[PDB]
Design a protein around this ligand. Sequence first.
Ligand code: BYE
Ligand code: BYE
Ligand code: MG
Ligand code: MG
Ligand code: ZN
Ligand code: ZN
Lengths: 320, 320
Amino acid sequence: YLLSPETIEALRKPTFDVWLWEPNEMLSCLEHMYHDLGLVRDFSINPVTLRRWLFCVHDNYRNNPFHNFRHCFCVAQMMYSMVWLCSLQEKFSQTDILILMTAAICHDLDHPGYNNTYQINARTELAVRYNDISPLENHHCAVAFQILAEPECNIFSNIPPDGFKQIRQGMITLILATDMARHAEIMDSFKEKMENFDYSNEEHMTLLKMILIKCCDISNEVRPMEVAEPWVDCLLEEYFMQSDREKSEGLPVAPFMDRDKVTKATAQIGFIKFVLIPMFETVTKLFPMVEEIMLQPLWESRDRYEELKRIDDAMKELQK
Amino acid sequence: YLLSPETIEALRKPTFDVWLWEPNEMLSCLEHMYHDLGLVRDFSINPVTLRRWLFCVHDNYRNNPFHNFRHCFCVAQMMYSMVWLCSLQEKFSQTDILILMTAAICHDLDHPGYNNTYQINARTELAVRYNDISPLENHHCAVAFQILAEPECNIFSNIPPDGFKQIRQGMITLILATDMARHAEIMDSFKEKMENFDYSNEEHMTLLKMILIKCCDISNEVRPMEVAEPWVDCLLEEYFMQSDREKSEGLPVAPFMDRDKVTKATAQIGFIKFVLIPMFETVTKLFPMVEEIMLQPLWESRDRYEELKRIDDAMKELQK
Ligand SMILES: C[C@@H](Cc1nc(=O)c2cnn(-c3ccccc3Cl)c2[nH]1)C(F)(F)F
Ligand SMILES: C[C@@H](Cc1nc(=O)c2cnn(-c3ccccc3Cl)c2[nH]1)C(F)(F)F
Ligand SMILES: [Mg+2]
Ligand SMILES: [Mg+2]
Ligand SMILES: [Zn+2]
Ligand SMILES: [Zn+2]
């Protein structure tokens, strides 16, 4: 739990290998980030509270194949990478940086392993509790502030009330923004503002922060093929658990979750080409350095999966 | 326990004296409304479940001076009056009517007597659960469907799932629409659609139903003076209870809830001229009969409060 200076240097890049570490180790990396970004400094975060809070946050993540503490670490680490790559401290206030990192760490708190569609279709407590309005994201966010409501885990204890309101409002906006059901909507608002972006316009900045946490949340394919690939299997593993249960309970099943229809290759080709690449393209208009560091590996991921599908076709064709 | 034909007859007019009845008589009036509007008939509502349900609903309303079961009966009874006054059954499907009546009855379920501003500023469990997004309305709605989730109270048990979904979505929209913080937004949207209203445009109808339930929710002043006045004192009783708690907790207090600034007269004059009259005025442009049966008493109510203000100001000079 004493990060070597080599690790501290690789922790700033999207190439970081998130699979090599264990909870304890990742917990230290996260702790490092808060000190390194000077958040501990500028918000008078009690360095000890920060430690408890991170274990507080860790305990509240479930052992799902995909939506687990490691996913949370990936998102926070990718966010951390982007703060350096795009020199976000020259554009954002320390408050926004805090919002971005805290939102990233807490965005999937207590995820059950079944998406909103299952919650809504099965009429779960979450769905009824949140009236079908992004039940999961709402829950994550609620769990996050319940944690910050425990004095022992309140890393925000030394922030004036005016600041807390601005931080809370910001985190809520960003966590709720990760519901993919809003992807098209958010992307449009953003592409619009982009026609004439203005870092002084508060709405532009909010959309930008919304886009940033969205990129980090689904940025797995931006990492090296060795690091990125296993995440797809973790996600499908979780999805199949849902589809089986849905089939069992007689609830509708989404095609991309049906073993007999989804193939890693075909799935990732469309995800990369129509969701990932386009989103990061919009961001590269503000941060050109992104094209080389994040779009590049995304183009390689796309091509790799396209070639990987030709192999699947030729192979299945060969069997019939 | 039974209703007289005179009562049943009067139940159709906004002049109905809602104070003359006890829970069991109100439950019976509500019951009659469902049979009379053809909702029991068109949705195969088990007549026994209808009564059980009305009871589950009653049991879940709290004994607040204002936000209690009688208030919910006021809203439902006014909605009922409007269905007749504006001949709503010629413009609305029976599903729309069901949504309107059931939403009006369930719109304030389990209200605590302290509004959203208190919830948010005091960081209560509700404001945390719903991330400061219309926490109360979200809660009322969830209780309504928790109630409907108990087979014995489920008046929708014989409605196919597609219908339930459409009714659920409709009820959620209407209940969340009662949060006055959204009053300006909704009125603007509606007035925009009013530039060329279209009864066949779905977005047009959703807004009209939102306006309708909002009209019923804050319509106390449309009723005869003797029936309306006591509600104002009831609301204020609840409001002072909040501002008292707010001052002795360090939380800000709403000027209109401030014992030292709010006078029944001044408050109602404003509420009547800048909220009520304007809202019913734009509604009248769609339903002409509304001007005489509802806009008229509101004008009277306004004039009476303006006179009461002069008297009030005089006596308060002396109390000094
Ligand atoms: C593998 C899925 C598509 C997909 N690919 C990703 O890399 C990725 C990363 N996150 N993420 C995701 C996770 C949870 C919810 C929504 C999304 Cl979008 C992803 N979804 C499937 F099966 F092909 F649809
Ligand atoms: C007396 C209040 C104004 C007011 N007058 C009403 O007749 C009325 C009816 N409902 N309603 C109301 C009730 C709950 C929440 C919001 C409103 Cl708007 C009302 N608020 C006060 F003190 F002047 F602000
Ligand atoms: Mg999520
Ligand atoms: Mg209410
Ligand atoms: Zn996530
Ligand atoms: Zn109400």
